[PDB]
Each structure stands twice: as structure tokens, then as C-alpha cells.
Design a protein around this ligand. Structure first.
Ligand code: HEM
Ligand SMILES: O=C(CCCCCn1ccnc1)N[C@@H](Cc1ccccc1)C(=O)O
Length: 454
């Protein structure tokens, strides 16, 4: 029996003030560096344990011993994502129902049907960059978010956000981002009941109403038109859970749409942003990825099959997910009393946090060059030990969107590498801005067209 370490405390507030910082994930990584593979973390009314080693996390990923927990972040997101798939407990009827209904909509096979709509947006991104003047640069996260948001709007409910036509965000996105911002602020409040936050709370209630009203209208409009487009909304309106034989109701459909819009916004564009960052910081890797793009993408527009042949691009994306996974943690609870790692006894209901970026730096798994960007680490998933790489979560509660995210990311990065040479013209210094996701803030490049037509 080992006593786990714990970072510095602040009297009655326990460890909570350590989260009152601009970059809490990066702060928690630094604590893990200092304290090792497990540390206790306490706040008023809260005890959890942060795990960072594959040795312990492989046990935590045992679904017979641990189930998904809603972290405080997820509990707060649930105020607007409801019992959508990402904020529901495994035992809620709507989790298994929606899971069973949506699985075929998200399979590798379903990507063949989304492919054309993803290409539509990817070409818009390429045309924007083809149309820049010589003296201009690219705001990378900003453009990647235009791409990923538009892609989930079109594939998700046949709706064009038309993000490449505008600077101001869509009304829905204004409220979604402000809601997510309130969540992060609320996690950092030492005195969350202070009347100083009454306005924040009033604003949050307003932003929830905007998200609900706008998505409910999307659903109502679709029902009234009878249109049967090949999108997630159509699948949810028509699908029946094989098990219960029931369809999802409209309220839960709205929560799923809200869930997908969160996931497909900065969470997914973060992957592309970090990938392009690592590529321009590693020119030999960029060249190898660019050589593959040119070899495989022989037609004016990529086909579904060509995207699947972009193996090295897929390895680039996995290595980007290894260093900066854009859902940086998830939470579990013990289903019964159990012992973690032969050393840490846990009681039924005890909570764990999996600190993914720190797992992905476990030198006993990856070797001493863990900070280097080497996509070749992913040549053979069979050489990687169990549960060493978890950017999409675990088990039946893993990311249902994983194939969607990787297909759109591989497609557009492939096209970017085919059509442009890239210059890190400012010698950009990585600055990772934290929301509930991660972004290389202010990352900019210049792109010189290879003048290959579409
Ligand atoms: C690179 C982009 C993405 C990453 C890194 C990511 C990561 C994750 C992770 C780690 C989880 C587990 C969370 C937990 O255990 O609390 C998760 C769950 C989920 N993700 Fe993603 N995701 C991405 C993109 C997407 C997209 C594009 C969609 C949908 C369009 C999506 C939909 C979901 C859903 C619905 C769940 C909940 C699944 C369930 O519990 O049944 N994700 N994601
Ligand atoms: O460590 C984290 C990282 C954030 C996890 C959410 C990530 N994500 C984003 C979208 N979907 C999930 N979050 C803990 C913080 C905490 C610990 C103890 C006491 C208070 C807060 C939590 O949210 O509970």
C-alpha cells in the first residue's frame, strides 16, 4: 500500500486554486512531472486522482472495474448538451439508445457517404488560400475552425455555416463559445456563489436558450419539409434502436446536434492546427508527408479511397494527437472496491482523471525522445502496448466521432500538402491557449501555391 502524493494546498480551498490559471491542463502536466504517475487532487466537495502512466491507466481502462464519470467540466457542459452522448451516464436509457442508433452513422463505411460534403468544404479552404495576395498570411486555427465547423454543419444537418464568407461567427456559435467559456470560468471560481457572477449566470441561461431555440427550429424545419438528406439529422429522425425498438425524441436529437457542434468546432480544428504546426517545425516530416500527398492525390479532387491511402498523413495526425490531444482528459469511477497497480486501494465510487497528454509522454512506452515529433512511431499499432494511446477515450464510451474527425482531417491536410508549400515566416513560438480544448494561439503561416488546379 502506497500513499499517493498531492500538490500544494491552500487551506480550506485544498488544491482548487491550482486550477485558477490560464493553462490548467499544462499546469496539471507540470504537477505530474513533479509528482509522478498518480497524485491526489482535492477541492471543496471533490476528491479525484490524476493518472499519467500507462501502467495505471491500462487498469483504469478495464470496463469491468471502471465506468465513465462526468467530470465537473462535463457536468457543467450537460447544462446545454443535456443527455447527449458525451454528457450522459452509461446507465441512462438515452445513452445506450443513442449509441445503438448512431453507431452506423459514424462507421468507417458511413464516411463514404460524407466524403463528398467534406470535399465541398475542403475545396473552399484550398480556394481561399489560392486567392491570397503575395503579402498575406494564414491564421491557421481560425481557418481550420471554419473548415471543421462547416463540415459538421453540412454532414450533421445539411446546413451551410458558410464560415469562409464571413468574419462574425454564427449566432449559434457565439452562444456555444460563450457557454463553454462560462464552463471554464466556473471551474476556476474559488467562491462560485459570489453575486459578482450573477451576470455570468444570467448570460449562461440566455446562451442555453439561444442554442435550444435555434437547433429545435432546425429539427422542426426538417420534419416539416420531409426532406431526406444523407445527414445525421435524417438518421436520427428515422432510426430505431434495435434493442428498445424506440427512436430518439426531438429533445435528445437537439442535445446530440449540440454535442456534435461542440466536438466538430475547436476540438477537431485543434488537431489540424497542431498537425500543421508540427509539420512546419519539422521540415523533413513535412516533406515526406508532402511526397505522399503528391503520389496518392492524383486527381483534381480526392476520392474516399485515396484518403485511406494517405497512410503517412494518418501517422502525422496520430503523432499530433499524441503530443496535444484536443480532449485532454476524461474521468472514470470505480464500479466496485478495487486495487490500482497493486499499490493504491480504491473504494466503490472513487474517481480517477486520465491526464492524456501526460500518458502520451510516458517514456517507458515511447522512449526518451517523447517530445520529438516522429510520426514513424505509428508504423505498427501492434507494437504499442495496450492503452498507451488514448486520444479518443476508452471502450464503449470512446469517441463515436473518431472516424469522422480523422477522415476530414486526413482529407484536408492531404489537399493542403498537395497544393501549397508552407513557410513558418514568424518563427512562431508555441502558445497553447486553453478553453475546454487546446489551440496553438496566434499560429500563422504563409502558403506558396504549387499552382495545381482543382
Ligand atoms: C480530433 C477530434 C476529436 C477528439 C480528440 C475527440 C475525443 C473524444 C474523447 C476523448 C471522448 C471521450 C470523452 C470522455 O470519456 O469523457 C469523446 C467522446 C465523444 N465524441 Fe469525440 N473527439 C473528437 C471529435 C469528435 C467529433 C468530430 C464528434 C461528432 C461529430 C465527436 C463526438 C463524440 C461523442 C458523441 C462522444 C461521446 C460518446 C459516448 O460516450 O457514447 N467527437 N471524444
Ligand atoms: O482536469 C480536468 C481537465 C478538463 C476535462 C474536460 C475536457 N473536456 C472537454 C470537452 N469534454 C471534456 N477537469 C477537471 C477539473 C477539476 C478537478 C477537481 C476539481 C475541480 C475541477 C474536471 O472538470 O472535473
Amino acid at each position: 500500500i502506497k500513499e499517493m502524493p498531492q500538490p500544494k494546498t491552500f487551506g480550506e480551498l485544498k488544491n482548487l486554486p491550482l486550477l485558477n490559471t490560464d493553462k490548467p491542463v499544462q499546469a496539471l502536466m507540470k504537477i505530474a512531472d513533479e509528482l509522478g504517475e498518480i497524485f491526489k487532487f482535492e477541492a471543496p466537495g471533490r476528491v479525484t486522482r490524476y493518472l499519467s502512466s500507462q501502467r495505471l491507466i491500462k487498469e483504469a481502462c478495464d470496463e469491468s472495474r471502471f465506468d465513465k464519470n462526468l467530470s465537473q467540466a462535463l457536468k457543467f457542459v450537460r447544462d446545454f448538451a443535456g443527455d447527449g452522448l458525451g454528457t450522459s451516464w452509461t446507465h441512462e436509457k438515452n445513452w445506450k439508445k443513442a449509441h445503438n442508433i448512431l453507431l452506423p452513422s459514424f462507421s468507417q463505411q458511413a464516411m463514404k457517404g460524407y466524403h463528398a460534403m467534406m470535399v465541398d468544404i475542403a475545396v473552399q479552404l484550398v480556394q481561399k488560400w489560392e486567392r491570397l495576395n503575395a503579402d498575406e498570411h494564414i491564421e491557421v486555427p481560425e481557418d481550420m475552425t471554419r473548415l471543421t465547423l462547416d463540415t459538421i454543419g453540412l454532414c450533421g444537418f445539411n446546413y451551410r455555416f458558410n464560415s469562409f464568407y464571413r468574419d462574425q461567427p454564427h449566432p449559434f456559435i457565439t452562444s456555444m463559445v460563450r457557454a463553454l467559456d462560462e464552463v471554464m470560468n466556473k471551474l476556476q471560481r474559488a467562491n462560485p456563489d459570489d453575486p459578482a457572477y450573477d451576470e455570468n449566470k444570467r448570460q449562461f441561461q440566455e446562451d442555453i436558450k439561444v442554442m435550444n431555440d435555434l437547433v429545435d427550429k432546425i429539427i422542426a424545419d426538417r420534419k416539416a419539409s420531409g426532406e431526406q438528406s444523407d445527414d445525421l439529422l435524417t438518421h436520427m429522425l428515422n432510426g430505431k434502436d434495435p434493442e428498445t425498438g424506440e427512436p430518439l425524441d426531438d429533445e435528445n436529437i437537439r442535445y446530440q446536434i449540440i454535442t456534435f457542434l461542440i466536438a466538430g468546432h475547436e476540438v477537431t480544428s485543434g488537431l489540424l492546427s497542431f498537425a500543421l504546426y508540427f509539420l512546419v517545425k519539422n521540415p523533413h516530416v513535412l516533406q515526406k508527408a508532402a511526397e505522399e500527398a503528391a503520389r496518392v492525390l492524383v486527381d483534381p479532387v480526392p476520392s474516399y479511397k485515396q484518403v485511406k491511402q494517405l497512410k503517412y498523413v494518418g501517422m502525422v495526425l496520430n503523432e499530433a494527437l499524441r503530443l496535444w490531444p484536443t480532449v485532454p482528459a476524461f474521468s472514470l469511477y470505480a464500479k466496485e472496491d478495487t486495487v490500482l497497480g497493486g499499490e493504491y486501494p480504491l473504494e466503490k465510487g472513487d474517481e480517477l482523471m486520465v491526464l492524456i497528454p501526460q500518458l502520451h509522454r510516458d517514456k517507458t512506452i515511447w522512449g526518451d525522445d517523447v517530445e520529438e515529433f516522429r510520426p514513424e512511431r505509428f508504423e505498427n499499432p501492434s507494437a504499442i502496448p495496450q492503452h498507451a494511446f488514448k486520444p479518443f477515450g476508452n471502450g464503449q464510451r470512446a469517441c463515436i466521432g473518431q472516424q469522422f474527425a480523422l477522415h476530414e482531417a486526413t482529407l484536408v491536410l492531404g489537399m493542403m500538402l498537395k497544393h501549397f508549400d508552407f513557410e513558418d515566416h514568424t518563427n512562431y513560438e508555441l502558445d497553447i491557449k486553453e478553453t475546454l480544448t487546446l489551440k496553438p494561439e496566434g499560429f500563422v503561416v504563409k502558403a506558396k501555391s504549387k499552382k495545381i488546379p482543382l
